[PDB]
Design a protein around this ligand. Structure first.
Ligand SMILES: COCCOc1ccccc1-c1nnc(Nc2ccc(CC(N)=O)cc2F)c2ccsc12
Ligand SMILES: Nc1nc2c(ncn2[C@@H]2O[C@H](COP(=O)(O)OP(=O)(O)NP(=O)(O)O)[C@@H](O)[C@H]2O)c(=O)[nH]1
Ligand SMILES: [Mg+2]
Ligand SMILES: [Mg+2]
Lengths: 167, 888
């Protein structure tokens, strides 16, 4: 009856909500509905370990920056998501990871890096630049698309077994 | 009669009130049996109101909206929101094992609960997708199916109030917390509502007074049951409330060996001049002083008698009554404010009287004869802005301001014009010679069509100063038209006490309260406990018992829930009693071994689990975490009790409910003080001053037994200095900084100086005493408050507090921070002085109780000095600044 507490973090509009909604109800949204803090849960089979996933969709807008401290104290792992169109996504993703290691003084915290909207034929972020920072943080990396179910399982499932590495 | 359900109901309500209802059938008093029968239409009235718009009206009765008085938010409270909006977390249960998912929304504070749901429905539908099936099916069938519920307790938002008007949301705005609400189906709540089954019980199935040419005379034949410890005499006196209608007369002194008087006592009052509420107050006094010592007069026993019965009949012929023991001291040999009636205990001094017998049954004249005599007096008796302004000056006086005989004659002369200023009615009523039928007849006519006034002013007409039924009937009708349920719960303890001032069981005030108690279960909850807590007092046990019976007979299934609370309290009363009986001297360790050994018993552990908290019926109490239960370090062994919160989302409010159970101290005064502190905070908040108080819950459930709310994360300032190893004057600012560092520090100093100002003013106005370092507590964020309000009405500022107020500076008195502090005290002191009439009324309504610090109006006169009511408002401020800047 293992339960894994996952937290999806990132900037606004990067698709952190469409990623989770794509996982649970086999669905895709085209409406930019801004999120503050929602929660989702669904049972998943991973490597024979039938487990429950408690996902915490956060706010990409900087207006609710004070709420980040609490969900970072409770989350076991974090799903950092950047937009492959916005260069600002890769800039403030440094502050997100560095703040995670600040509320948890441990320099090693489960945290797989994700980059959504890979289905888009127009991309402004190089794949090697994400793999460069992924190796710098000692973390994996998954390129995903929220409308085509492109590895949205692999993006979350990697973090599930990443948390098992610490455990 | 022998209906099986009635035999069961009669047994259940007998357990809830402490006495079997068959004792009420034994009472041969025709007034008592008439009350049980005639009060039932009030029960029928409220049951019909519950079943009017069923099931929504039944849900409103069981879970009424805990709402504030006004939807308007003050300026300082509105600015606590993000551009007028509030962030609210909406929860919903999904798994059969009570797993939860959440939505957080940013909504206007004005939105009704149905519009908050409309945002959640809009947010959920935008995540899924459908065309002409989303708007058609999802939006239609998900609307009108759900309601909002507070996470952690049984509070529901069942009415279309603005969301911020609910007290839970209002507190989250003032504390910075985030509201956590739960969505549940309406039919899920309606299925849990009980079924109404109220049926009527089995017991439901010649000469005018003004034509008596005689003076009042009363015989005193003899007395029985007197134990000697020189001479005795009986002191009598005709009273209209607390005021005597003539001079008191005594009897000739008779040796206490064998007492016989058989003498007629004449009174300086004409029989046609007897007012309706005229009463005979008598007692038995002893004289113990001879041969070198000044003689001393002490009352042995007392007893009052209504001169008219509940059928408006003047009492005549022989009569006997048993007398009541002396009260907790007295300021005279008579006790007019005492209760009227004979003593049920027959091994008490019995006094045999005889009232004059006129050949016919004497009745009080009806209003048709009274109104005709009033127009006769005013016809035989057959505008100026100068004295018109004086009438407004008399209206603003406090209820205990001495109105001179010149001003009384001045008010009575302008009695037809002072209907323009209807709030002057209490002042005008006290300027009436109630020993004159000519005056009372004209006063009946004016109050007959008197303009209604505010509830705060009409309650003054319900204390011991206004015993006339026409005056009280007007005051009740004012409450029936203007008193909301919110204010009714606020002044419920005052309105319950003034029931003792009524001279008849079946009156108009008791019908208004009983109807509201059977219409609002939050009201009926505390209505039950205020009545039940005084069932030990044999002077009111018959009135309150018959009232509890009529309540429990029609309160619905909540009787079953109350019996759980009663049985749980009786188990705690029995445990702490034998804990004192057999283990009072033994140490706390062996006391605990006895405690836990008695709490593991099944009969016990079953009764102390699964019932509603008497402090707050919305708080459910589940399993008793007896590992966290302990005996505290106080005089009379208080019981620190810990329950688990059985709510599905208890973790969002609190998982453990901690309540202190005290058995030994009288908690009636602590209730009153905490109630007044709550009112003072409401006055300060509604006019700008953000002075946060802490009126923690406190409820008396019987003779010196009651519950006390535990306040979390609070430390006695001694426990602050004691951790830090003896007393120093800078430790308070250090611990407040060690718990509030960086940016958070300035807000803690802000909250500290505001709560300290509110309690400096509160403790000075109320004059609470014995304030020491163990009476003052501080929370983690800096909220200061006081505890243990044992004595009041019998000037606080300490260098340690001022250092924290001036943020650690040395010259704290000459600081811009301190100048802002005392400016809050000045505005708060005057704010209470402007509502001085309200607080004087609350104290005077509590005189009927047996509280030690409230026996006469001279005890209440203390707040006239602290509020400086006889001086001017500026002269009062000058008085307060000098009194609160002496040194300090
Ligand atoms: C009783 O039936 C549910 C009725 O819910 C509602 C009724 C009216 C308005 C809103 C909702 C409502 N719906 N979904 C919510 N989160 C939620 C999201 C996804 C799932 C599917 C899953 N496995 O992750 C399950 C969920 F629960 C939330 C969270 C706060 S309100 C609400
Ligand atoms: N074409 C396409 N659009 C996508 C994809 N993933 C997300 N989007 C779009 O990107 C927009 C933003 O989606 P959203 O999940 O709300 O982003 P967010 O990071 O959660 N924003 P916030 O943090 O403020 O809640 C939406 O219009 C959504 O349809 C994808 O794989 N393909
Ligand atoms: Mg989102
Ligand atoms: Mg509450």
């Amino acid at each position: 009856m293992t339960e894994y507490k996952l937290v999806v973090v990132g900037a606004g509009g990067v698709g952190k909500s469409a990623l989770t909604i794509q996982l649970i109800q086999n669905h895709f949204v085209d409406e930019y509905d801004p999120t503050i803090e929602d929660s989702y849960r669904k049972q998943v089979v991973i490597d024979g370990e039938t487990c429950l996933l408690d996902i915490l969709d956060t706010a990409g807008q900087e207006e609710y920056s004070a709420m980040r401290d609490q969900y970072m104290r409770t989350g076991e792992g974090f799903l950092c998501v950047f937009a492959i169109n916005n260069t600002k996504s890769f800039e403030d993703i440094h502050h997100y990871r560095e703040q995670i290691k600040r509320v948890k003084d441990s320099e090693d915290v489960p945290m797989v890096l994700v980059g959504n909207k890979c289905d888009l034929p127009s991309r402004t972020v190089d794949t090697k630049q994400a793999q460069d920072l992924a190796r710098s943080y000692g973390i994996p990396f998954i390129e995903t698309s929220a409308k085509t179910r492109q590895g949205v399982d692999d993006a979350f499932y990697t973090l599930v077994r990443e948390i098992r590495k610490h455990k | 009669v022998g209906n099986r359900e009635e035999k069961i109901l009669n047994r259940e309500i007998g357990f809830a009130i402490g006495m079997p209802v068959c004792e009420f059938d034994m009472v041969k008093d025709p007034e008592v049996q008439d009350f049980r029968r005639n009060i039932l239409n009030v029960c029928k009235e409220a049951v019909d109101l519950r079943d009017l718009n069923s099931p929504h009206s039944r849900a409103m009765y069981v879970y009424p909206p805990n709402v504030e008085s006004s939807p308007e938010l003050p300026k300082h409270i509105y600015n606590k929101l993000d551009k007028g909006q509030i962030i609210v977390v909406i929860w919903v249960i999904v798994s059969p094992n009570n797993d939860k998912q959440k939505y957080t929304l940013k909504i206007n504070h004005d939105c009704v609960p149905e519009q908050v749901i409309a945002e959640a429905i809009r947010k959920k539908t935008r995540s899924m997708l459908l065309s002409s099936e989303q708007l058609k099916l999802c939006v239609l069938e998900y609307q009108g199916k759900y309601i909002l519920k507070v996470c952690g307790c049984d509070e529901y938002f069942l009415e279309k109030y603005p969301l911020s008007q609910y007290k839970y949301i209002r507190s989250c705005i003032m504390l910075g917390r985030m509201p956590n609400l739960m969505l549940m189906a309406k039919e899920s709540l309606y299925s849990q509502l009980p079924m109404d089954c109220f049926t009527m019980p089995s017991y439901s199935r010649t000469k005018s007074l003004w034509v008596i040419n005689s003076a009042l005379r009363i015989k005193i034949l003899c007395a029985t049951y007197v134990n000697v410890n020189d001479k005795i005499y009986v002191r009598t006196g005709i009273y209209h409330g607390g005021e005597p209608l003539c001079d008191n007369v005594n009897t000739q002194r008779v040796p206490c060996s064998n007492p016989r008087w058989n003498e007629w006592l004449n009174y300086d009052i004409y029989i046609p001049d007897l007012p309706r509420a005229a009463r005979l107050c008598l007692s038995i006094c002893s004289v113990k002083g001879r041969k070198g010592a000044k003689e001393e007069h002490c009352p042995l026993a007392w007893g009052n008698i209504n001169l008219f019965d509940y059928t408006d009949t003047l009492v005549s012929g022989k009569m006997a009554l048993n007398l009541w023991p002396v009260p907790h001291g007295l300021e005279d040999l008579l006790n007019p404010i005492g209760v009227t009636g004979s003593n049920p205990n027959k091994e008490t001094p019995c006094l045999e009287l005889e009232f004059d017998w006129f050949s016919s049954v004497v009745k009080f004249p009806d209003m048709s004869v009274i109104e005709e005599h009033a127009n006769w007096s005013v016809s035989r008796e057959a505008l100026r802005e100068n004295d018109k302004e004086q009438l407004k000056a008399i209206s603003t006086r406090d209820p205990l301001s001495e109105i001179t005989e010149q001003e009384k004659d001045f008010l009575w002369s302008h009695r037809h014009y002072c209907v323009t200023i209807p709030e002057i009615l209490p002042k005008l009523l006290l300027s009436v010679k109630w020993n004159s039928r000519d005056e009372v007849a004209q006063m009946y006519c004016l109050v007959k069509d008197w303009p209604p006034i505010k509830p705060e002013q009409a309650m003054e007409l319900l204390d011991c100063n206004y015993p006339d039924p026409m005056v009280r009937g007007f005051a009740v009708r004012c409450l029936e038209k203007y008193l909301t349920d919110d204010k009714l719960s606020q002044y419920l303890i005052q309105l319950v006490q003034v029931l003792k001032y009524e001279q008849y069981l079946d009156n108009l005030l008791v019908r208004f309260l009983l109807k509201k108690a059977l219409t609002n279960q939050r009201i009926g909850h505390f209505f039950f406990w205020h009545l039940k807590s005084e069932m030990h007092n044999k002077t009111v046990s018959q009135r309150f018992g018959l009232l509890l019976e009529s309540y429990c007979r029609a309160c619905g299934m909540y009787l079953k829930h109350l019996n759980r609370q009663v049985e749980a309290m009786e188990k705690l009363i029995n445990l702490t009693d034998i804990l004192k009986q057999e283990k009072k001297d033994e140490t706390q360790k062996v006391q605990m071994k006895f405690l836990v050994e008695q709490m593991r018993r099944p009969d016990f552990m079953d009764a102390l689990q699964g019932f509603l908290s008497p402090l707050n019926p919305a708080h459910q109490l589940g399993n008793l975490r007896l590992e966290e239960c302990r005996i505290m370090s106080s005089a009379k062994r208080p019981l620190w009790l810990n329950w688990e919160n059985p709510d599905i989302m208890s973790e969002l409010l609190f998982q453990n409910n901690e309540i202190i159970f005290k058995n030994g101290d009288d908690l009636r005064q602590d209730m009153l003080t905490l109630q007044i502190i709550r009112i003072m905070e409401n006055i300060w908040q509604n006019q700008g001053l953000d002075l946060r108080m802490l009126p923690y819950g406190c409820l008396s459930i019987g003779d010196c037994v009651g519950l006390i709310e535990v306040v979390r994360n609070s430390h006695t300032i001694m426990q602050i200095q004691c951790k830090g190893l003896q007393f120093n004057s800078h430790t308070l600012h250090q611990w407040l900084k060690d718990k509030n560092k960086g940016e958070i520090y300035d807000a803690a100093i802000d909250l500290f100086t505001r709560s300290c100002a509110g309690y400096c003013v509160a403790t000075f106005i109320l004059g609470i005493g014995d304030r020491h370092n163990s009476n003052i507590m501080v929370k983690d964020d800096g909220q200061l408050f006081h505890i243990d309000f044992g004595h009041f009405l019998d000037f606080v500022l300490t260098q340690d507090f001022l250092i924290v107020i001036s943020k650690g500076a040395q010259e704290c008195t000459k600081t811009r921070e301190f100048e802002r502090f005392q400016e809050m005290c000045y505005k708060a002191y005057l704010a209470i002085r402007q509502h001085a009439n309200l607080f004087i009324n609350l104290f005077s309504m509590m005189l009927g109780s047996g509280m030690p610090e409230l026996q006469s109006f001279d005890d209440i006169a203390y707040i006239r000095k602290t509020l400086a009511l006889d001086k001017t408002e500026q002269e009062a401020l000058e008085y307060f600044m000098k009194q609160m800047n002496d040194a300090h």
